[PDB]
């Protein structure tokens, strides 16, 4: 009933972000959602003396439409507020619960409401948008879980007491619940917590396994007959990998090429050359030496289209000091097109990133910006949105991570 005073960081005004344009289908859905949200008092219409704006989108989490607010800009402008469980990444199972509906029972500081204003756009500038602001704690605002935190601790304290070895981490609108139980015991423990949440008036509708995911090691080709070209590729790849693993050598491998040979000439792999390569497959097995996570610095993710539905990614903070690497595969399954694939990959990397470090990475996306701005919501399911930019994949980065 009583609100919590909220302020912007000193010397900052609220967000003024453009509303992207939407299909009539998505506008139609947003007007239905917002009409009921207003009926329930969760938002109210606003006048022209409110200059602020956050974009809104229609997505699907099901066949009914959901509404997503991109509070990235507001979140940057309110970060003022108030240890991330390192064991969560270890647990055998981790299940994610959408608890974002808890927020809508909480008044939002009346002085801050203007900063949450948003617009439902019209088609072809016929009308100006319909304009609302938030009366309650909105999903996606990083202030919402901070304000609700005390209530959340209260509702969870019983359940944590019964289950001292179960890890519960909150990030934005989601609870991450991790156990070492057998899967059936795990899902039962989840169902209890869901039942406990519901009967305390906190509604709730994805299980991960962080114990399995590993950081990919570099893979060198294994061939029956090697040509000059194959040895050149091998030498180039191993040259690349030696910025990372000191111990790699190419002396014996490149010796096999001394001369000026036709590209397709078959080079037998001599004994010393095979020894060097076998040793190099061994060096590529171990993990790197001094790569640690600095929580002050941003996480960056890069993604490469590998073809045939495959995508490689790296998360790092300093170039060539990779905290994690991975490769995602996609089943053609009718469509599974490039954007659907990239969009799913981004969500998986972000989830993994939230589980391991508790923050989302900043993506370098291999796609034209406008193409992304156009289609990313056709497949977006998360309730969060990471930062991203747009880049042009280098030529050899692709084949070296393949």
Burial of 213 (0-12, 13-18, 19+ CB in 10 A): middle
Q: Which does 371 bind (CB under 5 to 8 A by kind): other proteins, Mg ion, none?
A: other proteins
Smallest separation (angstroms) from other proteins to the CB of 60? 18
> Between residues 25 and 222, which has the closer beta carbon with respect to other proteins?
25
Structure tokens at 306: 């590998």
Reduce the DSSP state of residue 131 to 3 states and report it: strand
Closest CA to 4 of 120, 130, 141, 140: 141
Q: Which does 261 bind (CB under 5 to 8 A by kind): other proteins, Mg ion, none?
A: other proteins
Do residues 284 and 217 lie in contact, with contact meaning Cβ atoms separated by under 8 Å?
A: yes
Q: Which does 263 bind (CB under 5 to 8 A by kind): Mg ion, other proteins, none?
A: other proteins
Q: Which DSSP category does 259 fall into?
A: S
Q: Which does 21 bind (CB under 5 to 8 A by kind): other proteins, Mg ion, none?
A: other proteins
> Between residues 126 and 370, which has the closer beta carbon with respect to Mg ion?
126
Q: Which does 239 bind (CB under 5 to 8 A by kind): other proteins, Mg ion, none?
A: other proteins
> Between residues 61 and 305, which has the closer beta carbon with respect to other proteins?
305
Burial of 53 (0-12, 13-18, 19+ CB in 10 A): buried
The breaks in the chain (C to N more than 2.5 Å) occur after: 61, 82, 205
Q: Which does 328 bind (CB under 5 to 8 A by kind): Mg ion, other proteins, none?
A: none
Give the C-alpha separation, 227 to 48, whole Å: 71
Smallest separation (angstroms) from Mg ion to the CB of 125? 7
What is the binding site for Mg ion (CB under 5 A)?
A: 124, 126
Smallest separation (angstroms) from Mg ion to the CB of 124? 4
Smallest separation (angstroms) from other proteins to the CB of 79? 22
What is the binding site for other proteins (CB under 8 A)?
A: 21-25, 27, 47-51, 53, 123-128, 131, 227-229, 232-233, 235-236, 239-240, 250, 254, 257-264, 304-305, 307, 337-339, 341-342, 365-368, 370-371, 374-375, 392-396, 398
> Between residues 99 and 248, which has the closer beta carbon with respect to other proteins?
248
Give the C-alpha separation, 230 to 225, whole Å: 9
Does 109 appear as a known binding residue? no
Q: Which does 100 bind (CB under 5 to 8 A by kind): Mg ion, other proteins, none?
A: none
Only one residue has tokens 């991450």, namely: 176
Structure tokens at 150: 């005390």
> Between residues 126 and 271, which has the closer beta carbon with respect to Mg ion?
126
Smallest separation (angstroms) from other proteins to the CB of 167? 35
> Between residues 149 and 374, which has the closer beta carbon with respect to other proteins?
374
Q: Could you tell me how many residues make up the chain? A: 402
Give the C-alpha separation, 183 to 82, whole Å: 36
Q: Where is 348: in which H helix or E strand?
A: helix 338-357
Smallest separation (angstroms) from other proteins to the CB of 140? 21
Closest CA to 215 of 187, 244, 237, 195: 244
Do residues 383 and 142 lie in contact, with contact meaning Cβ atoms separated by under 8 Å?
A: no
Closest CA to 72 of 357, 363, 313: 363
> Between residues 211 and 338, which has the closer beta carbon with respect to other proteins?
338
Smallest separation (angstroms) from Mg ion to the CB of 267? 23
b/e string for 252-284 if b means 16 or more Cβ within 10 A? bbbebeeeeeeeeeebebeeebeebbeebeebb
Q: Which does 314 bind (CB under 5 to 8 A by kind): other proteins, Mg ion, none?
A: none
> Between residues 290 and 395, which has the closer beta carbon with respect to Mg ion?
395
Smallest separation (angstroms) from other proteins to the CB of 259? 5
Does 165 appear as a known binding residue? no
Q: Are strands 362-365 and 300-307 parallel, antiparallel or unpaired?
A: parallel
Which residues are known binding-site members for Mg(2+)? 98, 173-174
Q: Residues annotated in the binding site, as ranges?
A: 98, 173-174
């Amino acid at each position: 009933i009583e609100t919590v005073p909220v302020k912007l960081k000193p010397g900052m005004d609220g967000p003024k972000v453009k509303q992207w344009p939407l299909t009539e289908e998505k506008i139609k859905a947003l007007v239905e959602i917002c009409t009921e949200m207003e009926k329930e008092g969760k938002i109210s219409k606003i006048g022209p003396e409110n200059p602020y704006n956050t974009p809104v989108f229609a997505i699907k989490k099901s066949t009914k439409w959901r509404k997503l607010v991109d509070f990235r800009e507001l979140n940057k402008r309110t970060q003022d507020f108030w240890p991330h469980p390192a064991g969560l990444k270890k647990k055998k199972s981790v299940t994610v619960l959408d608890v974002g509906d808890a927020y809508f029972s909480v008044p939002l500081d009346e002085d801050f409401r203007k900063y949450t204003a948003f617009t439902i756009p019209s088609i072809n500038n016929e009308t100006p948008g319909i304009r609302y602001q938030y009366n309650v704690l909105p999903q996606g605002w990083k202030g919402s879980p901070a304000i609700f935190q005390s209530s959340m601790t209260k509702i969870l304290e019983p359940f944590k007491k019964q289950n001292p070895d179960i890890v519960i981490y909150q990030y934005m609108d989601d609870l991450y619940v991790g156990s070492d139980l057998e899967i059936g015991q795990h899902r039962t423990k989840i169902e209890e917590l869901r039942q406990h949440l519901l009967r305390w008036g906190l509604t709730t509708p994805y299980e991960l396994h962080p114990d399995k995911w590993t950081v990919q090691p570099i893979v060198l080709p294994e061939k029956d007959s090697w040509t000059v070209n194959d040895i050149q590729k091998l030498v180039g790849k191993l040259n690349w990998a030696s910025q990372i693993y000191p111990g790699i050598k190419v002396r014996q491998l490149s010796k096999l090429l001394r001369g000026t040979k036709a590209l397709t000439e078959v080079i037998p792999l001599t004994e010393e050359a095979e020894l060097e390569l076998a040793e190099n497959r061994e060096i590529l097995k171990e993990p790197v030496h001094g790569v640690y996570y600095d929580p002050s610095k941003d996480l960056i993710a890069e993604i490469q289209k590998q073809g045939q539905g495959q995508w490689t990614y790296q998360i790092y903070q300093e170039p060539f000091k990779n905290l994690k690497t991975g490769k995602y595969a996609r089943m053609r399954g009718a469509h599974t097109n490039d954007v659907k694939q990239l969009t799913e990959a981004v969500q998986k990397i972000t989830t993994e990133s939230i589980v391991i470090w508790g923050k989302t990475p900043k993506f370098k996306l291999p796609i034209q910006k406008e193409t992304w701005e156009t289609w990313w919501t056709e497949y977006w399911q998360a309730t969060w949105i990471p930062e991203w930019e747009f880049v042009n994949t280098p030529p050899l980065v692709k084949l070296w991570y393949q």
